[PDB]
Amino acid sequence: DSWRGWNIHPPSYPNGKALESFAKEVAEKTEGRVEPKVYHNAVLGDQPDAIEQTRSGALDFANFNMGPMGPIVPAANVLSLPFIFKSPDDMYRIMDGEIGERFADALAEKNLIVLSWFGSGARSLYNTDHPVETPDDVEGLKVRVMNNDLYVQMIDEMGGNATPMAYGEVYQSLKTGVIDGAENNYPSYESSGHYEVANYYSLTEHLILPECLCVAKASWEELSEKDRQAIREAAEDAAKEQRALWEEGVQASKQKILDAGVKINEVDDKSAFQAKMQPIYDQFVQEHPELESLVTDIQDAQS
Ligand SMILES: O=C(O)[C@H]1O[C@@H](O)[C@H](O)[C@@H](O)[C@@H]1O
Ligand SMILES: [Cl-]
Ligand SMILES: [Cl-]
Structure with a gap:
């Protein structure tokens, strides 16, 4: 076999x-x-x-x-x-x-x-222009996401605009200015080379997949x-x-990314980003009432 x-x-x-x-x-x-x-x-x-x-x-x-x-x-x-x-x-x-x-x-x-x-790990925003400290700093950023509509909703609610794209295309898209940013964990941000072309990494830590x-x-x-x-x-x-x-x-x-001069920052208040995601949760449980107990069981496991 x-x-x-x-x-x-x-x-x-x-x-x-x-x-x-x-x-x-x-x-x-x-x-x-x-x-x-x-x-x-x-x-x-x-x-x-x-x-x-x-x-x-x-x-x-x-x-x-x-x-x-x-x-x-x-x-x-x-x-x-x-x-x-x-x-x-x-x-x-x-x-x-x-x-x-x-x-x-x-x-x-x-x-x-x-x-x-x-x-x-935890996925965080990186971009080519400025540190993201509050959700308002995401305004005007065009951020690549993976192929799931929830991520477009996520970036839009944070204040930016999103584009789904294959992982392999992201490096060149950042380099040429077609997108301003993307989001990922530390080992991917580094391995992929994205850190060489997007020098700001802001620890939104918005997805743990x-x-x-x-x-x-x-x-x-x-x-x-x-x-x-x-x-x-x-x-x-x-x-x-x-x-x-x-x-x-x-x-x-x-x-490696620190040695290369990447600017890493914490966000002012992670709860400010989390609050803006509420409509995503509302829509999700309304659309999928049969999945609601799965959502609440995961939430309840972390009280
Ligand atoms: O952003 C992406 O597409 C990639 O993100 C990484 O974190 C995942 O390990 C990889 O499976 C994804 O293809
Ligand atoms: Cl990580
Ligand atoms: Cl892909």
């Missing part, structure tokens, strides 16, 4: 190393019956297209951010509500409990089998129980590794 897998990041990124460890452990633990290979840098497609190829069984496994999953799996959109998690540690705690299984079940209905959860390590349902269904169990074990090992590497990477990436 040859398996092809997808990663958007470079091979040396925390997620990349963890997926290479996964591939190696799978081959060993299945005695060569399943032999995964990871293709990095999104060479097999942009994230929405890779999601579709994995759902249809054309790709066997992947590491997907739950952000672009929202338009495909309704429950996953809960994770894209701005500020729904107070910190990465709260996200890990919640996703590692019974609530995380609700999201795995929802993905399975759309042909994706979640084996473990990777972290992706899980990422899955998942397998195509069609590929999963070809396996014996023994090999399913082996691959589960390999994925749990890979997630523990990824999370440890992740924190080391946040530290290393911050040092």
Whole structure:
């Protein structure tokens, strides 16, 4: 069983190393019956297209951010509500409990089998013009977002205007002035080179998104129980590794961007940004009353 897998990041990124460890452990633990290979840098497609190829069984496994999953799996959109998690540690705690299984079940209905959860820190605004200290500083900024309408609503409510765009296109768009900014965690802001062209990083920390390590349902269904169990074990090992590497990477990436002269600032009052997101939550629970208890259960877990 040859398996092809997808990663958007470079091979040396925390997620990349963890997926290479996964591939190696799978081959060993299945005695060569399943032999995964990871293709990095999104060479097999942009994230929405890779999601579709994995759902249809054309790709066997992947590491997907739950952000672009929202338009495909309704429950996953809960994770894209701005500020729904107070910190990465709260996200890990919640996703590692019974609530995380609700999201795995929802993905399975759309042909994706979640084996473990990777972290992706906290996404913050960066731009080419000035520090963002209050929401009014976002006025006039054209900010790239991922492919989920909630992010357009998010930027618009903060005061700016948004444009959905593939991750691979962002560097050149910033360089040429087509966009003024984008938003991401420390390791992506650094790895991608965006920090070289957008020198202001303002810690809005507005999205804390899980990422899955998942397998195509069609590929999963070809396996014996023994090999399913082996691959589960390999994925749990890979997630523990990824999370440890992740924190080391946040530290290393911050040092690199500081050394390069990036201007990092805290926002005056994060609660001022959070208050402006209220209409997004209102509209969401009105549209999706069947998801309301998922939203309130996550909120209640962080009182
Ligand atoms: O902004 C993006 O598109 C990227 O953001 C990173 O944080 C996620 O790890 C990666 O999956 C996304 O493709
Ligand atoms: Cl981060
Ligand atoms: Cl993409």
